[PDB]
């Protein structure tokens, strides 16, 4: 049983120390000061660990997990994505950890209120789903890529510019100047304006 223990906590620090590749039984056991059989009793496999790490990350850094008193569905989706983003960005390889997340029963109520709120605002259940999914998958996609290029750039031979053509180059400088966040908020805004206008 993980929740009673410090395995999660330590595993997070380790995740930072060594990234997801390096989160092996040997290093966790060590970090914790315990031999492998005791760690096995806490956690059977890596997927199970990653599941618990993901949840723990959402619980620490995903503060906009439900709509507020009076908030429109537009603002809820905005704040929820932004909040999700932060949680994924809070740790090394954070998005990779959330990949393939299966919500547990403890999370069912939050998910249900999300759907209940959107349908109360006049989405069909189905279209609510698509907005939540589109916002979700986009947010995750954005951060995974942000994080991978962050790692891969260091193992890579610096953009031999001039070879690249006029508009491309301008786009590289733009991104050099502004980073990922403006593109993320614009994309988010599109999805939302998309659903807003189908609604009516």
């Amino acid at each position: 049983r993980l929740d009673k223990s410090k395995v999660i906590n330590s595993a997070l620090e380790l995740l930072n120390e060594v990234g997801i590749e390096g989160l092996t039984t040997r290093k966790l056991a060590q970090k914790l000061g315990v031999e492998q059989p005791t760690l096995y009793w806490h956690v059977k496999n890596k997927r199970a660990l990653l599941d618990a790490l993901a949840i723990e990350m959402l619980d620490r850094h995903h503060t906009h997990f439900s709509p507020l008193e009076g908030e429109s569905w537009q603002d809820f989706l905005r704040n929820n994505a932004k909040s999700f983003r932060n949680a994924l960005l809070s740790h090394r390889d954070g998005a990779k950890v959330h990949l393939g997340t299966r919500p547990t029963e403890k999370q069912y109520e939050t998910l249900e209120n999300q759907l209940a709120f959107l349908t109360q605002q006049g989405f069909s259940l189905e279209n609510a789903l698509y907005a939540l999914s589109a916002v979700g998958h986009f947010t995750l996609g954005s951060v995974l890529e942000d994080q991978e290029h962050q790692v891969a750039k260091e193992e890579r031979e610096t953009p031999t510019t001039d070879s690249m053509p006029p508009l491309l180059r301008q786009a590289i400088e733009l991104f050099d100047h502004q980073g990922a966040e403006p593109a993320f908020l614009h994309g988010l805004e599109s999805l939302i304006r998309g659903f807003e206008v189908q609604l009516t």
Binding site: T25, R26, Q36
Partner: peptide, 4 residues
């Protein structure tokens, strides 16, 4: 994951 790899146990010993």
């Amino acid at each position: 994951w790899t146990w010993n």
